[PDB]
């Protein structure tokens, strides 16, 4: 029911990345954000894959392109939403997942930087970091990834996808 866009870091080029961000940007809403909108057109799904054969699905808000949460295998993780409407809305994402978590924090930079123990500007971006970020997000579902590395991997995703589509 939600639009899915694919991207892989395996054999990734400047073109494939640019086309990917173009595809994401082409789904962002431009009409004045109404309230009580159809739930089916509130979110876009970004299915990320890497060399390591791992795969995760990010959930992006159509209004601002920001990550509201993600799916890794049979588990789903959401940032704490800001309001009741957003809270109710995210209960319609990844609804058949058995393991379901809402973090005790929102997905904003100040918080993610505090968690990663570093600032945005110092966090190396690129295809190589996004490779590692995708694994880190995946292996979080199996207890492998620690919270600072997770928080760091979110920043890489948000900057390379959300920020990249936003301008």
């Amino acid at each position, epitope marked *: 029911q939600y639009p899915i866009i694919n991207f892989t870091t395996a054999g990734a080029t400047v073109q494939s990345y640019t086309n990917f961000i173009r595809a994401v940007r082409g789904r962002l809403t431009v009409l004045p954000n109404r309230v009580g909108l159809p739930i089916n057109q509130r979110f876009i799904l970004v299915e990320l894959s890497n060399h390591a054969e791992l795969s995760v699905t990010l959930a992006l808000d159509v209004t601002n392109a920001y990550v509201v949460g993600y799916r890794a295998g049979n588990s789903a993780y959401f940032f*704490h939403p800001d309001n009741q409407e957003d809270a109710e809305a995210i*209960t319609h994402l990844f609804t058949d997942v*058995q*393991n*379901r*978590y*809402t*973090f*005790a924090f929102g997905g904003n930079y100040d918080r993610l930087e505090q968690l990663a123990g570093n600032l945005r500007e110092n966090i190396e971006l690129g295809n190589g970091p996004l490779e590692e970020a995708i694994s880190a997000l995946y292996y979080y579902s199996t207890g492998g990834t620690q*919270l600072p590395t997770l928080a760091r991997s979110f920043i890489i995703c948000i900057q390379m996808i959300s920020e990249a589509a936003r301008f």
Partner: nanobody
Amino acid sequence: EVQLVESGGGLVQAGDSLRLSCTASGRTLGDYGVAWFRQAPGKEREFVSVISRSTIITDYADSVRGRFSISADSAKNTVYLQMNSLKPEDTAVYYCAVIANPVYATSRNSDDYGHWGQGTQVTVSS
């Protein structure tokens, strides 16, 4: 120091309503995320419902959605579970617990919870 006690359980008929109470002593319950779990005869401990400390996130198991309703009352230091349209499949011992893993506001995994109560028994007959 927190101590959780479940009450409200008993014998009912199918289609009936029932309201459970997770009462706390030792600390304020409004300072926790509170979940209900249950264990039916011959079955594993099952996630049922959770309410976040912030009170805006709730979550339910698929088998209880539309039927069960979680809510909190700090006036009494209690978290409720309204159970409607009860069926024999709901027969179980109902436990409540506090979310003990500070990374999550809500979880369906029992490992993320601590300070489990004794449990209150709910039996739905047909």
